[PDB]
Amino acid sequence: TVLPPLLTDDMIAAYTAALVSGTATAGWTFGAGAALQIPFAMQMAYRF
Amino acid sequence: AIPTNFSISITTEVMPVSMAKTSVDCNMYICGDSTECANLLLQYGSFC
Amino acid sequence: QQFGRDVSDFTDSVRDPKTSEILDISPCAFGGVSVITPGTNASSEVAVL
Numbered sequence: 001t002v003l004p005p006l007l008t009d010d011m012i013a014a015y016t017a018a019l020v021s022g023t024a025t026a027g028w029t030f031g032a033g034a035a036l037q038i039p040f041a042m043q044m045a046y047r048f
Numbered sequence: 049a050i051p052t053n054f055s056i057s058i059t060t061e062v063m064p065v066s067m068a069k070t071s072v073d074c075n076m077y078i079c080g081d082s083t084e085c086a087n088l089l090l091q092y093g094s095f096c
Numbered sequence: 097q098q099f100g101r102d103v104s105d106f107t108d109s110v111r112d113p114k115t116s117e118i119l120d121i122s123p124c125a126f127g128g129v130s131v132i133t134p135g136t137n138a139s140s141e142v143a144v145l
């Protein structure tokens with residue numbers, strides 16, 4: 001037999017979309033801790 | 049949004065570094081030190 | 097009761113059938129042999145663990 005995994009595909013999708021939206025409105029702050037509201041070109045200016 | 053006040057915190061993590069190193073004598077395992085067992089054991093060579 | 101078993105099912109405890117004296121069984125003696133040498137270039141004398 002085979003068993004389906006616990007963490008389903010749409011969960012696997014919805015954990016992945018929040019990796020994008022939080023990177024697209026909070027950027028470095030999305031991972032650094034509490035995610036902080038900021039423009040995306042400012043985030044690029046931080047990265048660059 | 050920029051942080052004004054903050055905190056610090058200690059977290060712990062735990063990860064093994066060694067193992068219970070063992071050893072198995074064959075004679076007191078596969079034989080129990082009967083004379084019969086040691087002599088059929090020569091038919092398997094130095095497998096132990 | 098007449099004989100004890102250990103936490104694995106080998107008989108380690110014998111009560112004497114004649115005197116009702118209960119006795120532990122130990123193993124005889126077994127272990128490993130190691131050899132200590134300083135190198136055949138260095139000596140010909142050994143120590144044995």
Ligand SMILES: *[C@@H]1O[C@H](CO)[C@@H](O)[C@H](O)[C@H]1NC(C)=O
Nearest residue numbers: 134135136137138139140141
């Ligand atoms: C080790 O052996 C070589 C010859 O095999 C010998 O010339 C040398 O003196 C030896 N080493 C020592 C410390 O005696």
